[PDB]
Amino acid sequence: LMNAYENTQASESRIRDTDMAEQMTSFTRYQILTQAATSMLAQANMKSQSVMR
Amino acid sequence: LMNAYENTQASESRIRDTDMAEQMTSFTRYQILTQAATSMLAQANMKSQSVMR
Amino acid sequence: LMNAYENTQASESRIRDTDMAEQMTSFTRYQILTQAATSMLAQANMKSQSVMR
Amino acid sequence: GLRRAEQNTEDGMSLIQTAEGYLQETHEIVQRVRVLAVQAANGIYSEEDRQQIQVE
């Protein structure tokens, strides 16, 4: 029973528990793209005033 | 029988039992490689943050 | 064979294994050049505003 | 291969170790025959006595 307790946990872990190291890889990537969009968002607004003169 | 039992038991353990001197070296070999990639991982998370200018 | 095992294991490490001392400095050099060149690319783009007079 | 061929030698000596282990008692018994043959070849024993040696 102990032998199956470990083996059952190993298979259940591999589908439910996340890979904290890889999950950081895609979290940091998408976090930066938020900054890029917010930066380009401000400059797209500054595009408007080119004809107010 | 005891003499023959000794010889086969000695022959048996040399196939099954592990060598602590040999295995501790290889165990530390991977543990070092575990820290190097993990430490260098944060470099990549900060790799592309510098083109935000 | 154990003596012969010592030679071949060391032989490969002289060809395949990395040199941590060499690469850590070389890692910083390539990062330094990119960080310095990053501002230069920003210098060129802002340069063209001089003709706005 | 060098690591593997050593373990093949590691159990290679094990096979010879067990083979000699059985021959140890084989040597002992033939000596037990040797000592009894000295006793049997005397000139004081009867056929009833000498056959009891043949029993062993």
Resolution in A: 3.2
Q: Are B53 and C42 in contact (CB under 8 A)?
A: yes
Q: Please tell me the number of Cα atoms within 13 Å of C43 on its side-chain side.
A: 6
Token pair of C20, please? 């941590």
Q: Are B1 and D18 in contact (CB under 8 A)?
A: no
Classified as helix, coil or strand, A38 is: helix
> How wide is the angle at C-alpha C21 spanned by C-alphas C15 and C24, nearest 5°?
110
Greatest distance between any 2 Cα atoms in chain D: 68
> How wide is the angle at C-alpha C46 spanned by C-alphas C44 and C51, nearest 5°?
105
Determine how many CB atoms are found less than 10 A away from the CB of residue A25: 12
Question: Of the candidates D25, D9, D19, which has an alpha carbon nearest to the alpha carbon of residue B8?
Answer: D19
Expt. technique: cryo-EM
Question: Of the candidates B16, B14, B32, which has an alpha carbon nearest to the alpha carbon of residue B24?
Answer: B32
Q: Are B43 and A23 in contact (CB under 8 A)?
A: no
CB pairs under 8 A between B and C: 7
Determine how many CB atoms are found less than 10 A away from the CB of residue A29: 12
Q: Does B3 touch chain A (CB under 8 A)?
A: no
> How wide is the angle at C-alpha B36 spanned by C-alphas C16 and C10, nearest 5°?
30
User: Which chain C residue has the Cα nearest residue B47?
Assistant: C31
Cβ contact D–B (≥3 pairs, < 8 Å): yes
